[PDB]
Amino acid sequence: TLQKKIEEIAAKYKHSVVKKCCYDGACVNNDETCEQRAARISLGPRCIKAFTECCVVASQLRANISHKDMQLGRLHMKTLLPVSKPEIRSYFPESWLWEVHLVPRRKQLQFALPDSLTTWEIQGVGISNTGICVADTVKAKVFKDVFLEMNIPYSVVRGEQIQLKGTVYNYRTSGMQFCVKMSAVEGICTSSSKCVRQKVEGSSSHLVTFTVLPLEIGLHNINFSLETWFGKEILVKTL
């Protein structure tokens, strides 16, 4: 690994001011040559030479070098970057139940849990004349064992045979049985609804494919009702 040149061409720009100019010179641009894409650089000639002399040494090192070899050099070139940018790979929704309330020794309030599969935590802080009392936390773990969700596209053109892909998931270790049916509407022309029994493996998934052909233009309504061994759940979708 790191054949000969990859260790030397990166250590030269290990503590350079234009090490980032060398880093994006070695990126794969198949339809532009080395000088053809260097002309649009405007950061001075010092960054151009760090670009080009890291660009020519990778097109040579991609002819007779392995696929396994060059994708190890993609990780060796990682230290020519600025340090790891702050990013998160999750999206946490806007936190509900954010209010204060005056409680005369007992109070009840009701609300709808949001359409999300995550384990909430409700904590309460009571400020009164005696002091502060952080209550014992409670959880609101909305957790379905077998559930579907459909990949409804955002925008369907009128007159297309749309295949509505969806996937059932089965968190349980024992594989079980299910059937999904679709609420036909007057607009949707789909190719009383029969239940055909498919079967998910344990701790796995299973694809669900419907097909529609819409005719009317607007915001329609399609209800996907997965009826597994643990009841019947209607999932309401807007196409």
Partner: protein, 648 residues
């Protein structure tokens, strides 16, 4: 003989209500005294005064509550740094220079989520209390500090209820990513500050989420030869990648704030993913041979930076992951002292309780600890003790030792050391301490002993404390006098008489809702000779349970272990009295807080588990000062950034 002890807190707080306890002894004719705080250095402007009646029905003990309001102090060009606690009666007239501070109250800032993404709203509210732990009703000026240290938004709000709801801070569509900071502040008269941190991170979504979950979160002596690292990748809930291509690289790091990393350009592995899971190993010793380091003595408190790029076989996508640091640790343990004062009493046993914490703060039980001790008496003659071993118990991580010291001890030099079975004695954690005996002219001591030390005190029940003197004038002692402190305020006092010829006796004390997080108890007596008298004192630190004054509890109805997305439930709050309840429903996957009593206890003055070098050090380390005939305080009011533990 006629003496008196007038006990005040160590530092007056401006705007507080400080309790000043006066106890006089050896009197028969009842009388009165005026405790008054005068200004400095003139004694002209009297801030507040009090009147106490020292009569026989009170057992010659009373207390006035004094108060320095902020509207009577010259601000602007300076703060006031000293006052005079002055006492005048027909039998005594003393005065002491007392420092004052403006650090009044607490500010807890509570944002809902710790990590935000762009175009989301930072919800924020401030729980404001004063130093008597009640709703402060003062105006608070929030400040929003970006990573660039800029005042990007300074919003202020008035308080009426104790919970100061602020408008929601809107993270922009393009923010400055990094650690932000919210700084709360009273607008006037007080130097109280609160600080809350949150993070702004850019949202990108992966084709599959790659995690790197290694074996242990620190490497010492057993993963220094083989370190099994596991890499997992999955698209969604259960959709897992089938094949992929894994390339790993490793590097040595100094600390997580210095972002320069010296990569080991020989340890770049290459494996294959098989339906999600690949187990790789990293022989650390042979791989750190470049940038030599040669040992586990070196690389100590250094990190390992593991970068992983998993390239999917089917679609061709390449998701990256990283670990910022796995600490290359020398010994897997850290030893400290839980609730041991480093002060002796001559002729009285010395209980030592060490705690074995691992290098990421867990209470590792079953870990054999060995104690060696050395008696250095008054004549500088080191005498060795027998070594004693014990086992760290798994419930709180605390081993227990007891040394029965000889009668003429002056300095104990004891060294703890782990005796784990499968580590070398250069990779065993060790610590060394030094305990100094309590000094007193006409050598006479006090040892107060809490009965149930192991379990926390329950409010409403009764504390039972056993008091032993070790005087040569034992039959001259008449009264045991005590003081109970909580949050730097004297909340109780009293006087139990001494049973005439019982060598030691027990005091019974009720534990109330004044002393909820913890408390101190300073007991003393007065042994008078033909010379000046002397107070002989000792103190302990108590561990009263966490029982709030009106017990809030919340419930969900119906209480199931699984809900439906869209299910209407009812939240059933139920307090003990009238209260303002603040609610927050946070998605618990952000945590990967609201601990308050470990911060609300920082109003306590003085540290350690009690004890002192002389009489006045016992009063000073409990968070008290005093003025007598018998002894003087003479205590240097320096900084002393002490670091004691007191709790498992």
């Amino acid at each position: 003989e006629q003496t008196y002890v007038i006990s005040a807190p160590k530092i007056f707080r401006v705007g507080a209500s400080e309790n000043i306890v006066i106890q006089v002894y050896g009197y028969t004719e009842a009388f009165d005294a005026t405790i008054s705080i005068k200004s400095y250095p003139d004694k002209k402007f009297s801030y507040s005064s009090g009147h106490v009646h020292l009569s026989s029905e009170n057992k010659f003990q009373n207390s006035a509550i004094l108060t320095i309001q902020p509207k009577q102090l010259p601000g602007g060009q300076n703060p006031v740094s000293y006052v005079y606690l002055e006492v005048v009666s027909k039998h005594f007239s003393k005065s002491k220079r007392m420092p004052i501070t403006y650090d009044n109250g607490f500010l807890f800032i509570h944002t809902d989520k710790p990590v935000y993404t762009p175009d989301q709203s930072v919800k924020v509210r401030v729980y404001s209390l004063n130093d008597d732990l009640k709703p402060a009703k003062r105006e608070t000026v929030l400040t929003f500090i970006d990573p660039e240290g800029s005042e990007v938004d300074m919003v202020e709000e008035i308080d009426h209820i104790g919970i100061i709801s602020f408008p929601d801070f809107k993270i922009p569509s393009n923010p400055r990513y990094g650690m932000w900071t919210i700084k709360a502040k009273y607008k006037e008269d007080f130097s109280t500050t609160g600080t809350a941190y949150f993070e702004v991170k850019e949202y990108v979504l992966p084709h599959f989420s790659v995690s790197i979950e290694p074996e242990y979160n620190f490497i010492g002596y057993k993963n220094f030869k083989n370190f099994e690292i596991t890499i997992k990748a999955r698209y969604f809930y259960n959709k897992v990648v089938t094949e992929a291509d894994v390339y790993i690289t490793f590097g040595i790091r100094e600390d997580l704030k210095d972002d320069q990393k010296e990569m080991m350009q020989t340890a770049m592995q290459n494996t294959m993913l098989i339906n999600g899971i690949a187990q790789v190993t990293f022989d650390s010793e042979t791989a750190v041979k470049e940038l030599s380091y040669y040992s586990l003595e070196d690389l100590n408190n250094k990190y390992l930076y593991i970068a992983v790029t998993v390239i999917e076989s089917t679609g061709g996508f390449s998701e990256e992951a990283e670990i910022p640091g796995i600490k290359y640790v020398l010994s897997p343990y850290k030893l400290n002292l839980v609730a041991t004062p480093l002060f002796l009493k001559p002729g009285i046993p010395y209980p030592i309780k060490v705690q074995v914490k691992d290098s990421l703060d867990q209470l590792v039980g079953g870990v054999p600890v060995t104690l060696n001790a050395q008696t250095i008496d008054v004549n500088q003659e080191t005498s060795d003790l027998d070594p004693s071993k014990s086992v760290t118990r798994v419930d709180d991580g605390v081993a227990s030792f007891v040394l029965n010291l000889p009668s003429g001890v002056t300095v104990l030099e004891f060294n703890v050391k782990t005796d784990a079975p499968d580590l070398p004695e250069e990779n065993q954690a060790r610590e060394g301490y030094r305990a100094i005996a309590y000094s007193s002219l006409s050598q006479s001591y006090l040892y107060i002993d809490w009965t149930d030390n192991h379990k926390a005190l329950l409010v409403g029940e009764h504390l039972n404390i056993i008091v032993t003197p070790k005087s040569p004038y034992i039959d001259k002692i008449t009264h045991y006098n005590y003081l109970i402190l909580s949050k730097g305020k004297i909340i109780h006092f009293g006087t139990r008489e001494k049973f005439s010829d019982a060598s030691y006796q027990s005091i019974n004390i009720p534990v109330t809702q004044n002393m909820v997080p913890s408390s101190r108890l300073l007991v003393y007596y007065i042994v008078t000779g033909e010379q000046t008298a002397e107070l002989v004192s000792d103190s302990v630190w108590l561990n009263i349970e966490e029982k709030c004054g009106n017990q809030l509890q919340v419930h969900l109805s119906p209480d199931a272990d699984a809900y439906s997305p869209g299910q209407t439930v009812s939240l059933n709050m139920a307090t003990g009295m009238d209260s303002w309840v603040a609610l927050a429903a946070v998605d618990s996957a952000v945590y990967g807080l609201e601990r308050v009593f470990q911060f609300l206890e920082k109003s306590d003055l003085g540290c350690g588990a009690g004890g002192g070098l002389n009489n006045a050090n016992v009063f000073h380390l409990a968070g008290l000062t005093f003025l007598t005939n018998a002894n003087a305080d003479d205590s240097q009011e320096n900084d002393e950034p002490c670091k004691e533990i007191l709790r498992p």
